[PDB]
């Protein structure tokens, strides 16, 4: 924050609030989104009862959730039953705030973001951590061991892919030289589109973010079909759709986070309006994601610790080192356009043999 | 670790318990607990009219329901001598293959599901769907169809079937394809599906596994083949097989199968020509309704028929045929009565799953799932 | 197997089963209740054979809204049932004229005839 | 050819031979000899063991030997090794009194499920199995199911004014030992068969 | 075999951008085929008259026996059926009913013949035992849905349609095809 | 609280509930693959839970064999409040074409049935008519033929216990 202004903590807090429940009503017309966006994938129509469009049935749903019965279960601890989607909540809206969605001023006189910070991704990561933390404690606080088996799978794979992130995020630091997002988001906007430097980090973020229930590993797991998944099973009324409620919104934080920072996100090159590209970018990588969550298999996790720990968190380091050894020598940022390139060149060659 | 895999949770598929002994993230012995749909059949039949069963007959594996139909049919009409038709015959071959193509349909789209995801079960839907709507046309029925008889089968084919078979047997191909496009050049499933599920043939022989699940571990024997009866034996016949027993093997295997049955449906369609549709002896088969308004032996034997039933001779019988669960087959004990004697019902699925313990020994959890669709189980058959 | 109660006369029945149960823990007994028809509960009778593992005791069919004070009869006896710690209750459907017929059979076969047709049921909807 | 090589070997030793014109053949071997003459049959190169069906024939109106009767079915995959395609039945009579009769899980691993089932819905006790627990009947059912003697359990179907249907007292059907509705039954009523 | 992961994802691509599949019950009526079975119909001959005699074969003809007739003797001032015979009462449980049509195949008048609804769900057990008068030619509906339509005054539209109906069913009505 | 006590508000989460109304399938024979062609054709219902606790609708879709009753008791009493019994097919409802030791003769023994479908298999749009039946049910817009209004639920009508 050497160069960005600062709103009064009434304004703060006031964006905060908007950013939540805009956030709500997000998750919840996502949720229609992916319903029918499915639906046109697998040949079939969505819900359009309870309609106009069908879009008035997370009005009917959320009705149905609350007046719902919001049982506790005895055999699980008191404390932790009710305090553990209290978490997974809290920590997974938080830190979508940072993602500047344009200019400063550009708010209406103020600040596209909530909060900005100096140090950003480790703001990131360190909310991370702490809805897992949400997921292996609903997991023993259920006191279901078959709840917990799942919850600790679970906590085991988005642990290590969470450790994935981290080195992925190495690389185009290295470049831009600050923790900051608006920095990164200019430096794109200058040198221009972070990926065309950074590519394998790229890949490996976006894979690490397979594992945060992105779908494609989901021996996350889901309860369903397997040794469960842990956290719900045991959750009825609103606790229930508070965990789902986090899970989608990590979903879509990660949707806005991979153009925010490897892309150039809003800051294209041309046109450039403020908030209009953002969050087509962030409709871009949801479709795409989407498209991901039908149309591909599961992993076991045994696999999926083999793919993210044994391959691409190697690879994430080893990525890193090649980029430090290009800033630290300061050839130019030019050897970065070519490697990168060529490196893609070469990930994506060797599939269609 | 015995982990309690419940009855009918969680998606441990078609209400069975599982008692996984297991300890991390293998699977030491599964100790697997049936029972939860018996029904009671082999009781109840033998209150009922050699007709009355055939309502009885397509209810156990309702999948390949055709396959209970014609093995009990076989099984009666032998032991009371009766002569099918030719062109009931080849209809009946046909239901058989098109209730295949159902089945298998469903087989593979369950799979699918099972451990992995979710797309490809619609697009079987959608193919099972034109297939039922050809069940609907001909038997007034989407499945449970009341159609074969001791002599034949109940009546003959609507204007409309021939034309919606040929539509379904053209893009079927294409679309068989499709499926198999998807699957045999396996994404993950490749990782997932190969090394899990055991099979050794000498096993499979010592436990009895006979149903298709048997000829993807390099066993070569198919009831239409080995012991042909409606006529199979005068087809233009693929039998499909795998090399080692995976999981993915089996799955293949069964794809392949649908093109060759969809190919024995072209080639029975291509046999068929106008006649009668069944066994006109009238202590088999009931008067033809038109002449009820004319002769006294017709209502005689129409009241008689339907009220009473008939006898067959005082014998055991039984005949092997091939669901798409394997060998199927009626051991029918009548004493000259209106109602079977008894009535044991072979059941495929029964005998198959001797073999689960030994399968899913030392395979993954998550592929635990995976391992028991892949063996295609219907508890309909399995309990009873 | 003993038989205690008469027809169709509620309160006398229920006292005199609350005098034959006693100390009784009944945690692996099952227990029978006998009626004609599925659906209609509201002008229903009601018999009970409870088989307790070690021996079996009938009651004939004066239970149930059938008869005045019944209803309330009923439901005092499955409360009581439930109290011991029976759990397992069952409904078992016969015809109207087997009912007679049926408590006049000898105990071992009524006995078998009686859990051959037994159907598993919530003993909820007798309270 | 291993069919043949059974049925000259049980006309020498006295055991008696059932054929229907159908194309079904048996073998009933005594008591004794069932154990070892069938581990025989194992090991005379029977690769599958089928079925095993019991057989309760209290209400079969010819008398039998022995009330329950249990049929194995032993086979020679022909897809195998040297398959012939051999298939036959094999007829064990079982008392009444005695349940007994030993298991071929030794033999077949197919043995143990079937040999529990046949436990469950008729008295019969296999002998060496692994495990006889009870199979398909629910875990507090008391008693054998299908044998005979054990009622089908019927319902009354339920219409509208005190109209009831007791189905073993509507059942237009006969049994072999059912009398029919007249004097008595002759003819096709006594058992029917066409002559092909 | 990484090219799969590609391919698969392509074909369903394709699908998406094909639109069409399905069909929207009840808004949209289901297409059914002609020998389909439904709901029981007894019909009458051109005269009017019954073609149920009332002679309980379909009854006998019963799986799950479900069918009670209590037979009855035409009066010869005012007819209801061709011989002296005629059903004092038809009743079919549908929830025994197994809808097998071994009835109406028994049936010697051309009687009992299984008819078109399926739209037949309804709360009380009892109210699902129908009786004769709930099944004639003449009668257009289900029995919750002509309860709905009394109880709102709004008519009865059935959610199916056929090509034509069977010549058994002969005199039975329904939205057919086009043929309207 | 239920759902319940101001006409504006009760109305509007009573449609919330039956526009939402949330089936928790319980497969049990050839019944449960007909009503997985009821998945395809949805849009109110077809996503779960699948696990009871999510849910409540419960669709009893099969034959009900006697050692299964209990299990399918807790499954029931195992599911959150509001919740519904669809009765799916002739062997759930009554007894069935199977009339003997083996099976429950109806499932309204265990479980309180709140709407009832006949067939075997019911074709999936007559399961559409009874859970639009249960919708419009727990609307409180329901009557049975002896002219009274049926409750949203039932299964708020048995002691529990
Ligand atoms: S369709 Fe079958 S079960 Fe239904 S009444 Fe007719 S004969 Fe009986
Ligand atoms: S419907 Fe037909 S079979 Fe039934 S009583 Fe009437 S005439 Fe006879
Ligand atoms: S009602 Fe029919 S379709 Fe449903 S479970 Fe029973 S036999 Fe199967």
């Known amino acids: ?353 | 670790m015995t982990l309690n895999v419940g009855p009918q949770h969680p998606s441990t598929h078609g209400v069975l318990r599982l008692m996984v002994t297991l300890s991390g993230e293998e699977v030491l012995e599964v100790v697997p607990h049936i029972g939860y749909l018996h029904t009671g059949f082999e009781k109840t039949m033998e209150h009922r009219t050699y007709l009355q069963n055939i309502t009885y007959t397509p209810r156990m594996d309702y999948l390949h329901s055709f396959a209970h139909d014609l093995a009990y049919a076989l099984a009666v009409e032998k032991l009371l001598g009766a002569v099918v038709p030719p062109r009931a015959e080849t209809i009946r071959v046909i239901l058989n293959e098109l209730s295949r193509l159902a089945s298998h349909l469903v087989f593979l789209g369950t799979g699918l599901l099972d451990l992995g995801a979710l797309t490809p079960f619609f697009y079987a839907f959608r193919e099972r769907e034109t297939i039922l709507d050809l069940f609907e046309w001909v038997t007034g029925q989407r499945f449970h169809h009341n159609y074969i008889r001791i002599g034949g089968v109940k009546e003959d084919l609507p204007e409309e079937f021939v034309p919606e078979l040929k539509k379904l047997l053209e893009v079927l191909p294409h679309r068989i394809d499709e499926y198999e496009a998807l699957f045999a050049e396996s994404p993950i499933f490749y990782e997932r599906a190969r090394g899990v599920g055991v099979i050794p043939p000498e096993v499979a022989i010592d436990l009895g596994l006979t149903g298709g699940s048997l000829r993807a571990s390099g066993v070569n024997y198919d009831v239409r083949k080995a012991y042909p009866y409606s006529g199979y034996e005068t087809y233009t016949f693929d039998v499909p097989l795998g090399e080692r027993g995976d999981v993915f093997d089996r799955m293949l295997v069964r794809i392949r199968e649908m093109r060759e049955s969809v190919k024995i449906i072209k080639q029975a369609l291509e046999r068929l020509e106008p006649g009668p549709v069944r066994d006109p002896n009238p202590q088999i088969t009931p008067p033809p309704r038109h002449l009820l308004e004319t002769s006294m032996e017709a209502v005689i034997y129409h009241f008689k028929h339907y009220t009473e039933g008939f006898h067959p001779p005082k014998g055991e019988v039984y005949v092997p045929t091939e669901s798409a669960r394997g060998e199927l087959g009626y051991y029918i004990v009548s004493d000259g009565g209106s109602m079977p004697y008894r009535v044991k019902v072979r059941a495929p699925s029964f005998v198959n799953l001797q073999s689960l313990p030994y399968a899913c020994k030392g395979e993954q959890v998550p592929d635990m799932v995976a391992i028991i669709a892949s063996l295609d189980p219907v508890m309909g058959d399995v309990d009873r | 197997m003993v038989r205690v109660g008469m027809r169709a006369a509620p309160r006398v029945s229920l006292e005199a089963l609350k005098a034959a149960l006693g100390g009784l823990k009944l945690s692996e007994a099952k227990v029978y209740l006998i009626t004609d028809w599925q659906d209609k509960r509201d002008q229903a009778r009601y018999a009970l054979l409870l088989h307790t593992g070690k021996k079996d005791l009938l009651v004939p069919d004066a239970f149930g809204p059938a008869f005045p004070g019944g209803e309330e009869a009923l439901s005092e006896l499955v409360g009581l049932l439930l109290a011991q710690g029976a759990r397992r209750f069952y409904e078992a459907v016969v015809s109207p004229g087997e009912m007679t017929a049926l408590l006049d059979l000898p105990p071992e076969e009524l006995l078998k005839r009686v859990m051959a047709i037994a159907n598993p049921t919530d003993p909820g909807i007798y309270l | 050819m291993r069919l043949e090589r059974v049925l000259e070997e049980a006309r020498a030793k006295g055991y008696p031979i059932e054929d229907n014109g159908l194309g079904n053949l048996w073998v009933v071997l005594p008591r004794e000899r069932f154990k070892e003459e069938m581990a025989h049959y194992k090991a005379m190169g029977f690769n599958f063991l089928a079925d095993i069906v019991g057989l309760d024939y209290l209400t079969y109106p010819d008398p039998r030997p022995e009330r329950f009767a249990v049929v194995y079915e032993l086979v020679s995959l022909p897809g195998w090794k040297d398959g012939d395609g051999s298939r036959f039945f094999v007829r064990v009579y079982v008392p009444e009194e005695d349940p007994r009769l030993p298991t071929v899980t030794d033999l077949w691993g197919s043995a143990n499920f079937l040999e529990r089932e046949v436990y469950d819905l008729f008295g019969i006790v296999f002998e060496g199995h692994p495990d006889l627990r009870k199979i398909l009947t629910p875990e507090d059912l008391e008693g054998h199911p299908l044998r005979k003697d054990y009622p089908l359990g019927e319902t009354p179907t339920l219409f509208r004014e005190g109209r009831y249907i007791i189905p073993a007292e509507f059942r237009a059907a006969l049994t072999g030992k059912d009398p029919g509705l007249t004097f008595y039954k002759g003819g096709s009523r006594k058992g029917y068969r066409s002559l092909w | 075999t990484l090219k799969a992961l590609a391919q698969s994802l392509g074909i369903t691509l394709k699908y998406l951008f094909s639109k069409p599949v399905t069909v929207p019950y009840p808004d949209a009526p289901v297409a059914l085929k002609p020998r389909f079975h439904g709901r029981h119909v007894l019909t009458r001959h051109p005269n009017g008259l019954e073609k149920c005699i009332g002679c309980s074969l379909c009854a006998a003809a019963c799986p799950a026996y479900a069918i009670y007739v209590e037979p009855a003797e035409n009066d010869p001032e005012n007819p209801v059926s061709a011989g002296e015979r005629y059903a004092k009462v038809y009743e079919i449980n549908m929830l025994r009913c197994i809808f097998c049509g071994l009835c109406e195949e028994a049936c010697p008048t051309g009687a009992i013949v299984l008819g078109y609804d399926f739209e037949m769900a309804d709360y009380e057990y009892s109210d699902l035992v129908y009786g004769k008068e709930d099944m004639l030619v003449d009668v257009v509906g289900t029995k919750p849905q002509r309860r709905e339509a009394k109880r709102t005054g709004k008519p009865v539209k059935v959610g199916y349609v056929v090509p034509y109906v069977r010549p058994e069913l002969e005199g039975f009505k329904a939205p057919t095809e086009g043929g309207k | 609280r239920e759902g319940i006590l101001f006409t504006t508000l009760e109305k509007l989460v009573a449609w919330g509930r039956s526009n939402s109304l949330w089936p928790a399938t319980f497969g049990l024979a050839c019944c449960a693959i007909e009503m997985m062609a009821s998945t395809d054709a949805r849009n109110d219902l077809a996503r779960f839970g699948a696990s009871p606790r999510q849910a409540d609708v419960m669709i009893v879709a099969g034959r009900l064999s006697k050692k299964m009753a209990p299990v399918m008791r807790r499954v029931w009493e195992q599911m959150p409040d509001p919740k519904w019994v669809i009765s799916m097919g002739a062997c759930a409802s009554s007894g069935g074409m199977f009339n003997n030791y083996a099976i429950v003769q109806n499932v309204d023994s265990v479980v309180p049935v709140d709407v009832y479908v006949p067939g075997c298999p019911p074709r999936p749009e007559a399961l559409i008519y009874a859970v639009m039946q249960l919708q419009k049910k727990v609307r409180g817009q329901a009557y049975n033929e002896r002219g009274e209004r049926l409750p949203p639920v039932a299964a708020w009508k048995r002691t529990r216990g």
């Open chain 1, 1 to 353: 924050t050497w160069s960005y202004p600062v709103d009064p903590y009434w304004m703060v807090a006031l964006k905060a609030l908007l950013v939540v429940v805009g956030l709500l009503t997000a998750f919840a017309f996502m949720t229609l989104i992916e319903r029918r966006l499915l639906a046109r994938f697998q040949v079939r129509m969505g819900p359009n009862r309870v309609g106009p469009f069908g879009l008035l049935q997370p009005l009917a749903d959320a009705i149905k959730s609350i007046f719902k019965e919001d049982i506790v279960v005895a055999q699980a601890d008191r404390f932790l039953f009710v305090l553990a989607p209290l978490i997974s909540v809290v920590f997974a809206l938080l830190a979508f705030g940072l993602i500047p969605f344009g200019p400063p001023g550009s708010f209406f006189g103020y600040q596209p973001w909530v909060i900005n910070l100096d140090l950003g991704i480790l703001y990131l990561f360190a909310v991370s951590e702490l809805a897992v933390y949400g997921i292996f404690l609903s997991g023993w606080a259920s006191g279901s061991k078959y709840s917990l088996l799942g919850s600790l799978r679970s906590s085991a794979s988005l642990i290590s892919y969470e450790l994935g992130l981290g080195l992925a995020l190495l690389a185009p630091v290295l470049l831009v030289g600050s923790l900051n997002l608006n920095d990164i988001v200019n430096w794109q906007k200058e040198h221009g589109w972070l990926f065309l430097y950074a590519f394998p980090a790229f890949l490996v973020y976006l894979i690490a973010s397979m594992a945060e229930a992105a779908r494609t590993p989901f021996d996350l797991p889901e309860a369903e079909q397997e040794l469960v998944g842990g956290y719900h099973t045991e959750y009825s009324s609103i606790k229930w759709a508070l965990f789902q409620m986090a899970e989608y919104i990590h979903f879509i934080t990660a949707s806005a986070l991979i153009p925010t920072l490897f892309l150039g996100g809003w800051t294209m090159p041309v046109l450039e309006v403020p908030y209009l590209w953002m969050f087509l970018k962030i409709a871009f990588f949801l479709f795409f994601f989407i498209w991901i969550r039908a149309t591909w298999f599961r992993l076991r996790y045994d696999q999926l610790l083999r793919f993210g720990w044994g391959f691409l968190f190697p690879l994430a380091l080893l990525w890193f080192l090649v980029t430090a050894l290009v800033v630290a020598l300061d050839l130019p940022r030019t050897y970065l356009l070519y490697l990168s390139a060529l490196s893609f060149l070469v990930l994506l060659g060797a599939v269609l043999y």
